[PDB]
């Protein structure tokens, strides 16, 4: 009952993706350029199906810089992941909660069971617990 | 047989990279907003160091933005920008046919010398065949 690491999730369907600066509520610790990765069972979910079991989903976040008024990516600081399993998850609404500092395998960054996440991606409860929605 | 073709489906291709292009910078006008760059499987041959074979396509897909406290949030669609491989039908403006489309919609085509304003820039990268983009993480 461990989030697994999305291996290969860069070659997925980019959902969409939003900068936020200092000062936004999310700053800590989402600040950055971030961007939505689905594969191919939560675009499923996304296209107005339910989520299939093994659905997945990545928030990519990177730093960045301003430079002369252009905001240029940097370095990754984090990605999250919500992967679906009805069952193995049901604790936390049918969906695991983790993230991986820097992207790496190694560095799991959520110490309770995923409630912190869950708590604010109940607000979505009526869209499976999604933010993001499809734009074309 | 110097068109470039409309790339359907490149919203399923590899996102490369994304930056933004803020009021004050040189480019504002007219690559403002935030971009994403696609690339399909010919293309990431190239990118990745390898060459780049006819057929590669690499898109600039460009939105407006709209501030939100202390957001930026995607707006709508102003353009793609397309460069389509083609060492011969495209040796004029260097292997690459440039297009653009307006809002994205395949008949809105914005080019209208053959892709010589496009390719005066692009010029600069010679060295990497004329593409600015690099592969990242
Ligand atoms: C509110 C205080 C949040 C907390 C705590 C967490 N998330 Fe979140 N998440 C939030 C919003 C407003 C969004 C949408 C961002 C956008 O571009 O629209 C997100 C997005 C995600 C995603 C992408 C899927 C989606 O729901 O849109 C993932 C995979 C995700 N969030 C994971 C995640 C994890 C693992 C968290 C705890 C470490 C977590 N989120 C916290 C708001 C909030
Ligand atoms: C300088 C004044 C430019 C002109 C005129 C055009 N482009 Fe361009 N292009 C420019 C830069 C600095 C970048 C990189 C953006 C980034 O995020 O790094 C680009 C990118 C492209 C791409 C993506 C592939 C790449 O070269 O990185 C495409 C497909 C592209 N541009 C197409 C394009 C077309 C069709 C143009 C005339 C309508 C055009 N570009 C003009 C700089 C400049
Ligand atoms: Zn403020
Ligand atoms: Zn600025």
Same mark, same amino acid.
């Given at each position: 009952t461990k989030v697994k690491? =999305?291996? #290969? &999730?860069?070659?997925?369907? +980019?959902?969409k993706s939003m900068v936020i600066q200092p #000062? +936004? =509520?999310?700053?800590? =610790? &989402?600040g950055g350029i971030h961007h939505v990765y689905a594969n191919a069972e939560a675009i499923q979910g996304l296209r107005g199906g339910n989520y299939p079991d093994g659905a997945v989903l990545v928030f990519d976040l990177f730093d960045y810089q301003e430079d002369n008024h252009a905001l240029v990516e940097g370095k990754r600081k984090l990605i999250g992941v919500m992967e679906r399993d009805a069952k193995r998850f049901s604790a936390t609404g049918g969906w695991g909660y983790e993230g991986f500092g820097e992207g790496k395998p190694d560095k799991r960054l959520v110490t309770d069971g995923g409630q912190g996440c869950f708590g604010c991606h109940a607000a979505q409860k009526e869209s499976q617990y999604v933010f993001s929605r499809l734009r074309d």
């Open positions: 690491y =999305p291996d #290969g &999730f860069r070659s997925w369907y +980019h959902v #000062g +936004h =509520p999310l700053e800590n =610790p &989402f």
